[PDB]
Curated annotation (Swiss-Prot), chain C:
This is Spike protein S1. Binds to host ACE2. RBD also interacts with the N-linked glycan on 'Asn-90' of ACE2. Cleavage of S generates a polybasic C-terminal sequence on S1 that binds to host Neuropilin-1 (NRP1) and Neuropilin-2 (NRP2) receptors. Interacts with host integrin alpha-5/beta-1 (ITGA5:ITGB1) and with ACE2 in complex with integrin alpha-5/beta-1 (ITGA5:ITGB1). May interact via cytoplasmic c-terminus with M protein. May interact (via N-terminus) with host bilirubin and biliverdin, thereby preventing antibody binding to the SARS-CoV-2 spike NTD via an allosteric mechanism. It comes from Severe acute respiratory syndrome coronavirus 2 (2019-nCoV). The chain holds residues 537 to 584 of 1273 of the full protein. It comes from the Viruses. Attaches the virion to the cell membrane by interacting with host receptor, initiating the infection. The major receptor is host ACE2. When S2/S2' has been cleaved, binding to the receptor triggers direct fusion at the cell membrane. When S2/S2' has not been cleaved, binding to the receptor results in internalization of the virus by endocytosis using host TFRC and GRM2 and leading to fusion of the virion membrane with the host endosomal membrane. Alternatively, may use NRP1/NRP2 and integrin as entry receptors.
Swiss-Prot record, chain F:
Disulfide bonds join 9-31, 14-20. The chain holds residues 730 to 778 of 1273 of the full protein. It comes from Severe acute respiratory syndrome coronavirus 2 (2019-nCoV). Precursor of the fusion protein processed in the biosynthesis of the S protein and the formation of virus particle. Mediates fusion of the virion and cellular membranes by functioning as a class I viral fusion protein. Contains two viral fusion peptides that are unmasked after cleavage. The S2/S2' cleavage occurs during virus entry at the cell membrane by host TMPRSS2 or during endocytosis by host CSTL. This is Spike protein S2.
Length: 176, 163, 48, 313, 48, 49, 48
């Protein structure tokens, strides 16, 4: 149109002639309001899906321990502490990350007396001299007993079995 | 005779902050630099104002098609390919294992936005700048801004619902 | 006071307070960030 | 991801017309605000590639001894003898999925060689480290011990693994070859990638064919209005044409933004599936495959990912 | 081109990043004026 | 799911007017795109079931 | 109707599926012209 001020349109032109310049200011300002509220409702949808992700982070990371990977922080999740912020929640995620490692040798089973012994909890590790039992996230060697193992089949069907004895704790208890 | 339009494309400016330096790097996107009129040709376009190198580091300002840029050191803007991290392979055999003997406890922050600023736009004051002749033809358009008032109230009733 | 305005065609509706800014001797009116009428010097008396 | 597009108001609206750009300044900044939204979806699809592919920065590599207990992993790994770093499935994945009006197509940040280098680093960490390289430093774990923990996540004891090691690995290598026979024959199996490239292609040609329409004017040619008509009576035909070309340009930015909202929810579902099915063992039911999930092997794809979910049935 | 970033963003301070300012186009230099040839004439010599 | 709907370009814009239908051809194929968006809605409401 | 699917899809090959082409409506045949009844007449015979 000729001007942007609506008082300059009415007080200068004819009322049959100012009305066609008025609706260009009406539909021009309504189209700028229509692209604002459609960008608002698109931004209202992505701010709902992040708040539903934050409510999932409030329910699993804060109200308990979630078993997910890379959801409540990078690594094994232990606990979470949320903090207040303007227009959002800032979460302090406590994670479990291993730092130092060491190489060992391993075997899936132990041939004791012709039968295969599989580990119940942990994995079979060796330092080159003896064979021990430790977990996968930390090093804590334990002696191979019958309580830490369970028998499953013979030694001829499994692949990678080595020959070692299993310490049975009931055998020195009969003379002690 | 074959009608082809002459060479055109977008111009972008690769620059650091004004508190640090003032050098720029002009990127003719989609334009080869034999047809434009210390230079390097990429897949997105021939870059003017950057020294291309062979080593690749961690960059900050991306360009396109693998080419990235950063401001390093007697200082100028350099450009290189995007580094995908340090290569460190892990060995493998049928009888070895690697057990961790120590750990660390770290706190990693995660920021998620929840709400936003609730606004409300009225039809009488935004469209008409305290005008009485504007409001008489505002009723001739029916109910446009009554639906925008229901949409802005429907946004603002979701913001305290999200909290 | 909320009154009507008529300053050589520059119409408006609002109140009038004393301005504390510096102004030009040839200035008819000023404009804000919305580019509309917000400060009017009197054509007889000279109060911006 | 999607296709990054950028359009200017100088060439799409004005067909080399000097009077059209002078009347574009009277309308304000309509084409400035859609330019800020088009670079907002341009950096969003570049962030969607970094959220899915770039989970870890350490690039791993495979050992040259390709023996993992009778497991044939040569089909999902990229061939180093080829000049293109693509897999045997990924040679069929890129084969099945196949101007001057100011419309440009921006290239993405991560190329096809950089995506497959991120894909082969996550694939080598799956077979040599398993679930530990997504939670810090990678550890050396053998492949017989990786199937013991993944059976233990669904309550299956380790006695069926070693007693049936020849039957499990023959069932896996026959099912991997059944994927390559089905993907090379059935081209409609990749239809979830096909509607991403076809909706972006059908949005572009409707931007061209709306320029042939007049939007209530007597002609759609800007030269025919200015050279023939009187210049106060011609300019009301320019304002009919500059409004109809802007509303179709305001149509294209709004359908792409809800398509950006749909491609953000699927990439967040992909980055969840990159962290739960690939980086560890998922305890969910019908999330990483129908049934008891064991492991997953991601593959590269045009504007997407291809998941090879194995299931215990 | 540093001032072209300030001319589009409407700010006197430019942060670290990549910004698009304008578009390059080769301007036309000459103008080809064409016409059909001197064939298909009219017999004006029969009256002149 | 939601209620599946469709709109006609000729009937909703023009209330049985023959002089309104030929003046929609100067706008082009614009009202087909509002028809093609709602028919794409009616497929994915059946997919959500 | 097979050729009706080709015109609305802008393609010479139609794949398997359900497609909408146009809308059916019964066209009008007659036109009822109505007027009010001849009553409330005026005395024109007083001068004629």
């Amino acid at each position: 149109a000729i001007s942007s001020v609506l008082n300059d349109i009415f007080s200068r032109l004819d009322p049959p002639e100012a009305e066609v310049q008025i609706d260009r200011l009406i539909t021009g300002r309504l189209q700028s309001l229509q692209t604002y509220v459609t960008q608002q409702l698109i931004r209202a949808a992505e701010i709902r899906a992040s708040a539903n992700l934050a409510a999932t982070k409030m329910s699993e990371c804060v109200l308990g321990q979630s078993k997910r990977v890379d959801f409540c922080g990078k690594g094994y999740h232990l606990m979470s502490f949320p903090q207040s912020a303007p227009h959002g929640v800032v979460f302090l995620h406590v994670t479990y990350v291993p730092a130092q490692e060491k190489n060992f040798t391993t075997a899936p089973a132990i041939c004791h007396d012709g039968k295969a012994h599989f580990p119940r909890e942990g994995v079979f590790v060796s330092n080159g001299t003896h064979w021990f039992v430790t977990q996968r996230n930390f090093y804590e060697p334990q002696i191979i007993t019958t309580d830490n193992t369970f028998v499953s089949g013979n030694c001829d069907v499994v692949i990678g079995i080595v020959n070692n004895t299993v310490y049975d704790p009931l055998q020195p208890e009969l003379d002690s | 005779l074959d009608i082809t339009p002459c060479s055109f494309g977008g111009v972008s400016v690769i620059t650091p902050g004004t508190n640090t330096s003032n050098q720029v790097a002009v990127l003719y996107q989609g334009v080869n630099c034999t047809e434009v009129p210390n230079v390097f040709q990429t897949r997105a376009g021939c870059l003017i104002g950057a020294e291309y190198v062979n080593n690749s580091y961690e960059c900050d300002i991306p360009i396109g098609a693998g080419i990235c840029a950063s401001y390093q050191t007697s200082q100028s803007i350099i450009a290189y390919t995007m580094s995908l991290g340090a290569e460190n392979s892990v060995a493998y055999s049928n009888n070895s294992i690697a057990i961790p003997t120590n750990f660390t406890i770290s706190v990693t922050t995660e920021i998620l936005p929840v709400s936003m600023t609730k606004t409300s736009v009225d039809c009488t004051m935004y469209i008409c700048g305290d005008s009485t002749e504007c409001s008489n033809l505002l009723l001739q358009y029916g109910s446009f801004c009554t639906q925008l008032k229901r949409a802005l109230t429907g946004i603002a009733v979701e913001q305290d619902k999200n909290t | 006071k909320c009154v009507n305005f008529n300053f050589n065609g520059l119409k408006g509706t609002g109140v009038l307070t004393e301005s504390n800014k510096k102004f030009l001797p040839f200035q008819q009116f000023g404009r804000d960030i919305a580019d509309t009428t917000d400060a009017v010097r009197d054509p007889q008396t000279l109060e911006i | 991801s999607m296709t990054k597009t950028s359009v200017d108001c100088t060439m799409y609206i004005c067909g080399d017309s000097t009077e059209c750009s002078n009347l574009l300044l009277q309308y304000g900044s309509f084409c400035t605000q859609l330019k800020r939204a088009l670079t907002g979806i341009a950096v969003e699809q570049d962030k969607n590639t970094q959220e899915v592919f770039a989970q870890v920065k350490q690039i791993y590599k495979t050992p040259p001894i390709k023996y993992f207990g009778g497991f044939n992993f040569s089909q999902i790994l990229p061939d180093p003898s080829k000049p293109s770093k693509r897999s045997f499935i990924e040679d069929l994945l890129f084969n099945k999925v196949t101007k001057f009006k100011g419309l440009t197509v921006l290239p993405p940040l991560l190329t096809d060689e950089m995506i497959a280098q991120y894909t082969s680093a996550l694939l080598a960490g799956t077979i040599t480290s398993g679930w530990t390289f997504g939670a810090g430093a990678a550890l050396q774990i053998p492949f017989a011990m990786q199937m013991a923990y993944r059976f233990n996540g669904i309550g299956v004891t380790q006695n069926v693994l070693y007693e049936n090691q020849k039957l499990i690995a023959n069932q896996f290598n026959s099912a991997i070859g059944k994927i390559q026979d089905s993907l090379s024959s059935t081209a409609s199996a990749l239809g979830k990638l096909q509607d991403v490239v076809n909706h972006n292609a059908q949005a572009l040609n409707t931007l061209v064919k709306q320029l042939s329409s007049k939007f209530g004017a007597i002609s759609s040619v800007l030269n025919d209005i200015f050279s023939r008509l009187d210049p106060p009576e011609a300019e009301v035909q320019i304002d009919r044409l500059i409004t109809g070309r802007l509303q179709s340009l305001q149509t294209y930015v709004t359908q792409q933004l809800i398509r950006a909202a749909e491609i953000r929810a699927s990439a967040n579902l992909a980055a969840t599936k990159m962290s739960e099915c690939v980086l560890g063992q998922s305890k969910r039911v019908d999330f990483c495959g129908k049934g008891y999930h064991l492991m997953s092997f991601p593959q590269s794809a045009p504007h997407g990912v291809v998941f090879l979910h194995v299931t215990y049935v | 081109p540093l001032s072209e970033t300030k001319c589009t963003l409407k700010s006197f301070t430019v942060e670290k990043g990549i910004y698009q300012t304008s578009n390059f186009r080769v301007q036309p230099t000459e103008s080809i004026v064409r016409f059909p040839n001197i064939t298909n004439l009219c017999p004006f010599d029969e009256v002149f």
